[PDB]
Design an enzyme around this catalytic site. Sequence first.
Site, PDB file in Angstrom:
ATOM      1  N   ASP A 128      13.554  68.795  34.937  1.00  0.00           N
ATOM      2  CA  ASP A 128      13.996  70.065  35.303  1.00  0.00           C
ATOM      3  C   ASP A 128      15.267  70.256  34.495  1.00  0.00           C
ATOM      4  OD1 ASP A 128      13.850  72.629  36.366  1.00  0.00           O
ATOM      5  OD2 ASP A 128      14.964  72.268  37.994  1.00  0.00           O
ATOM      6  N   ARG A 132      20.640  76.327  33.582  1.00  0.00           N
ATOM      7  CA  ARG A 132      21.007  76.625  34.998  1.00  0.00           C
ATOM      8  C   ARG A 132      21.436  75.469  36.081  1.00  0.00           C
ATOM      9  NH1 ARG A 132      15.454  77.124  34.833  1.00  0.00           N
ATOM     10  NH2 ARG A 132      14.308  75.431  35.632  1.00  0.00           N
ATOM     11  N   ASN A 133      20.928  74.226  35.564  1.00  0.00           N
ATOM     12  CA  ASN A 133      21.154  73.010  36.036  1.00  0.00           C
ATOM     13  C   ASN A 133      22.334  72.227  35.567  1.00  0.00           C
ATOM     14  OD1 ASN A 133      19.171  73.150  38.429  1.00  0.00           O
ATOM     15  ND2 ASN A 133      17.485  72.481  36.907  1.00  0.00           N
ATOM     16  N   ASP A 146      21.115  68.320  39.979  1.00  0.00           N
ATOM     17  CA  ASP A 146      19.777  68.616  40.386  1.00  0.00           C
ATOM     18  C   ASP A 146      19.033  67.570  40.248  1.00  0.00           C
ATOM     19  OD1 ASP A 146      16.940  70.610  39.619  1.00  0.00           O
ATOM     20  OD2 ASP A 146      17.859  70.236  41.603  1.00  0.00           O
TER      21      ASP A 146
HETATM   22  C1  LIG Z   1      32.586  79.256  40.962  1.00  0.00           C
HETATM   23  O1  LIG Z   1      31.198  79.526  40.927  1.00  0.00           O
HETATM   24  C2  LIG Z   1      30.353  78.481  41.143  1.00  0.00           C
HETATM   25  C3  LIG Z   1      30.715  77.246  41.261  1.00  0.00           C
HETATM   26  C4  LIG Z   1      30.199  76.262  41.489  1.00  0.00           C
HETATM   27  N1  LIG Z   1      30.408  74.857  41.536  1.00  0.00           N
HETATM   28  C5  LIG Z   1      29.664  73.800  41.887  1.00  0.00           C
HETATM   29  N2  LIG Z   1      30.385  72.430  41.719  1.00  0.00           N
HETATM   30  C6  LIG Z   1      29.877  71.556  42.317  1.00  0.00           C
HETATM   31  C7  LIG Z   1      28.373  71.342  42.515  1.00  0.00           C
HETATM   32  C8  LIG Z   1      27.880  72.735  42.835  1.00  0.00           C
HETATM   33  N3  LIG Z   1      26.602  72.836  43.364  1.00  0.00           N
HETATM   34  C9  LIG Z   1      25.711  71.745  43.876  1.00  0.00           C
HETATM   35  C10 LIG Z   1      24.752  71.071  43.284  1.00  0.00           C
HETATM   36 CL1  LIG Z   1      24.156  71.903  41.911  1.00  0.00          CL
HETATM   37  C11 LIG Z   1      24.167  69.976  43.846  1.00  0.00           C
HETATM   38  C12 LIG Z   1      24.511  69.562  44.986  1.00  0.00           C
HETATM   39  C13 LIG Z   1      25.551  69.737  45.555  1.00  0.00           C
HETATM   40  C14 LIG Z   1      26.295  70.833  45.177  1.00  0.00           C
HETATM   41  O2  LIG Z   1      27.404  71.456  45.901  1.00  0.00           O
HETATM   42  C15 LIG Z   1      27.690  70.032  46.603  1.00  0.00           C
HETATM   43  O3  LIG Z   1      26.383  69.658  46.552  1.00  0.00           O
HETATM   44  N4  LIG Z   1      28.473  73.936  42.533  1.00  0.00           N
HETATM   45  C16 LIG Z   1      28.475  76.348  41.579  1.00  0.00           C
HETATM   46  C17 LIG Z   1      27.941  77.652  41.371  1.00  0.00           C
HETATM   47  O4  LIG Z   1      26.787  77.858  41.541  1.00  0.00           O
HETATM   48  C18 LIG Z   1      26.167  77.176  40.473  1.00  0.00           C
HETATM   49  C19 LIG Z   1      29.070  78.697  41.474  1.00  0.00           C
HETATM   50  O5  LIG Z   1      28.789  79.975  41.267  1.00  0.00           O
HETATM   51  C20 LIG Z   1      27.883  80.451  42.573  1.00  0.00           C
END
Ligand SMILES: COc1cc(Nc2nccc(Nc3c(Cl)ccc4c3OCO4)n2)cc(OC)c1OC
Length: 253
Positions: A128, A132-133, A146
């Site tokens: 994937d 976006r990932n 992801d």
């Molecule tokens: C500032 O706007 C955004 C920041 C952001 N940051 C971010 N950083 C690390 C991980 C994550 N998502 C995530 C993932 Cl992808 C996998 C597993 C996780 C996750 O969080 C803890 O466990 N996000 C992310 C934003 O969304 C993409 C964002 O805009 C909303």
Amino acid sequence: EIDVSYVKIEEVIGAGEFGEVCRGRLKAPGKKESCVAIKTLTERQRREFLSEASIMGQFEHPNIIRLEGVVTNSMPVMILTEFMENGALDSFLRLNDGQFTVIQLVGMLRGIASGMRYLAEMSYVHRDLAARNILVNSNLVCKVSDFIPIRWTAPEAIAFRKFTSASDAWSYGIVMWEVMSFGERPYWDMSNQDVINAIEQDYRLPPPPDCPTSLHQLMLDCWQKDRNARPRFPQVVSALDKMIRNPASLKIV
Ligand SMILES: COc1cc(Nc2nccc(Nc3c(Cl)ccc4c3OCO4)n2)cc(OC)c1OC
């Protein structure tokens, strides 16, 4: 894993499959406070949630999202990672359309390719890979996260469910196109089926506006129908490093 007293959830910043994504602070004894992303949370679905942490926890690389830990002996169940200040790459680029230089974009692509180089070396197939990932930090460092998306997926993996590192290389080409197009959607409004037929009938995405020809050629290489003809990720990184060494090469458009 992580004592819940060590975690402060600040802002809710997004929505995920099983719940919220939040910005927070992690402070454990002996260690300085750090900024973290926190996902918060069915039984099967709980293991579904937590599996991402188990996979993510297998990896240690500067271009792969770093896992800090989980909260499981308590509720809500949490996954904590490093915080990526600039979020998803596709939206970050759309917001910054035209505003980063080719060399900056190549750096982002190089970081992504290194991440993928590592995963392929560990025999991990992503399946994937899409802008976006990819998450972006304050220093513009891009990290794979992801752990069937038709318009990112290799023709053989769509036809046969054959997912390999070589199908990942096809997806990486699409990511290259996304980055060089500042987060445009692959194949714009073509439908999935139209995309499936277009590819089988030899259609390939054109160079994005202002895209160096050498980067578009590398995309075409990634999109060869013969999966064995595609560059492996070490060759991808080396190609990108060559362009960084020799920025002259990138002026031809
Ligand atoms: C500032 O706007 C955004 C920041 C952001 N940051 C971010 N950083 C690390 C991980 C994550 N998502 C995530 C993932 Cl992808 C996998 C597993 C996780 C996750 O969080 C803890 O466990 N996000 C992310 C934003 O969304 C993409 C964002 O805009 C909303």
